[PDB]
Amino acid sequence: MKVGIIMGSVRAKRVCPEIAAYVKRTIENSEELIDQKLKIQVVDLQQIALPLYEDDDELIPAQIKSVDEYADSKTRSWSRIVNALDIIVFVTPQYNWGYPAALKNAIDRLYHEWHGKPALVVSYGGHGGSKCNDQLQEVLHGLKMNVIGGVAVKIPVGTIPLPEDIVPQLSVHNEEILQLLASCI
Amino acid sequence: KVGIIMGSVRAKRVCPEIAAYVKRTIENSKIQVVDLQQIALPLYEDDDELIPAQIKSVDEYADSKTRSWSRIVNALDIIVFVTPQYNWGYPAALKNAIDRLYHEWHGKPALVVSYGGHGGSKCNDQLQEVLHGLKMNVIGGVAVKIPVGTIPLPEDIVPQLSVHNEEILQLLASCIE
Ligand SMILES: Cc1cc2nc3c(=O)[nH]c(=O)nc-3n(C[C@H](O)[C@H](O)[C@H](O)COP(=O)(O)O)c2cc1C
Ligand SMILES: Cc1cc2nc3c(=O)[nH]c(=O)nc-3n(C[C@H](O)[C@H](O)[C@H](O)COP(=O)(O)O)c2cc1C
Ligand SMILES: [Ca+2]
Ligand SMILES: [Ca+2]
Predict the structure, then answer these.
(1) Are A53 and B46 inside 8 Å of each other by CB?
(2) Helix residue spans in B14-91 (DSSP H)
(3) What homologous superfamily does CATH list for B1-177?
(4) Measured between alpha carbons, how far is A105 from A10 in angstroms, rounded to an integer?
(5) Interhelix angle A130-142/A101-108, nearest 10 degrees
(6) Of A45, A4, A49, the residue nearest A23 (C-alpha)
(7) Which of A25, A135, B5, B135 has an alpha carbon 20 to 30 Å from B86's alpha carbon atom?
(8) Chain B residue with minimum CA distance to A136
(9) Cβ atoms of B149 and B119 closer than 8 Å
(10) Which CATH class, in words, describes the domain spanning A1-185?
């Protein structure tokens, strides 16, 4: 079944891909999970480029029951991508003790596509991005997602790309990410 | 100098009515209703590679739209965030605008007037935490209940928004001095 790794950052130079790459390759090389052949998709919101100010729909997304009911075509396309996901791993930075606007914008554009789906929040920042993790988990709860958990990944702020010597040390989180993902499958 | 920053940029929106309620609530005891639709700070288009916390003055911003946005914000004395609650959180348009600046928020008093089916209290809490992180002097927050799905608001509801007069006025008059 499909695992969507949704990146939160859309900054031109950013750490998000490195974290998303770690999460992808952690699931892939996992011994428990090599058998369940999960298919993995890294979703780049910089590439989707979901508009902030233009939105043809005037109905609340909760009021929308299916994809064809959306007046907006860019929403419908984003609706398909997310609907095709069975498990979602949000890989997100923390901006000012909160979640990035690009991620919140994309999350808020949809509704029924999130329902009941397991969601793991992998945050990152100077102190793991714990405050963003906390906040985003609550937004996922509001969407009635099955919030598996949240892992907070410490990085050295200001250093892109990550040092050679810290990349290996991301793998301290391997056991928790895998125990959480596996018991869900 | 008091700025009422609207959080919603939806085409059909309740936000301007609540901003109007807050405005006329104040001046019925120097306002500026800021519209982020009109300011139109881009979500994706950043010239700036510099994190706004590293920026010591407006000039360092490589972005023209950011410099003007800084100008507007840095000028203000008191800020009242009038914001809806989207899925137990704050709107992206408001978070995007907030995150583009840093030093301009330092020490500024800020009151959050949220709204929603139950006053948008969850958004109010979440936004206050972000404001705390920007080292703003957070007065507090007031949750304004609305009927949801009817825009503009049912006319009978607009007067009864004034239940929140006491609290907004109490919280505001204290900070004035
Ligand atoms: C707008 C802004 C806000 C930030 N806020 C925080 C924060 O509150 N806590 C933290 O630990 N790092 C914060 N950072 C530093 C980020 O951890 C760092 O820039 C990281 O690279 C952001 O992730 P990204 O490169 O994938 O966008 C912030 C950076 C910027 C851009
Ligand atoms: C993205 C989306 C999610 C929403 N989530 C909530 C919700 O979590 N709780 C709530 O009380 N209202 C929620 N609202 C309903 C709003 O209260 C109502 O639509 C309001 O008019 C939105 O404010 P605005 O018109 O100024 O943008 C949501 C609205 C939208 C657009
Ligand atoms: Ca917590
Ligand atoms: Ca919490």
Answers:
(1) no
(2) 15-26, 36-39, 64-75
(3) Flavodoxin domain (3.40.50.360)
(4) 12
(5) 10
(6) A4
(7) B135
(8) B89
(9) no
(10) alpha beta
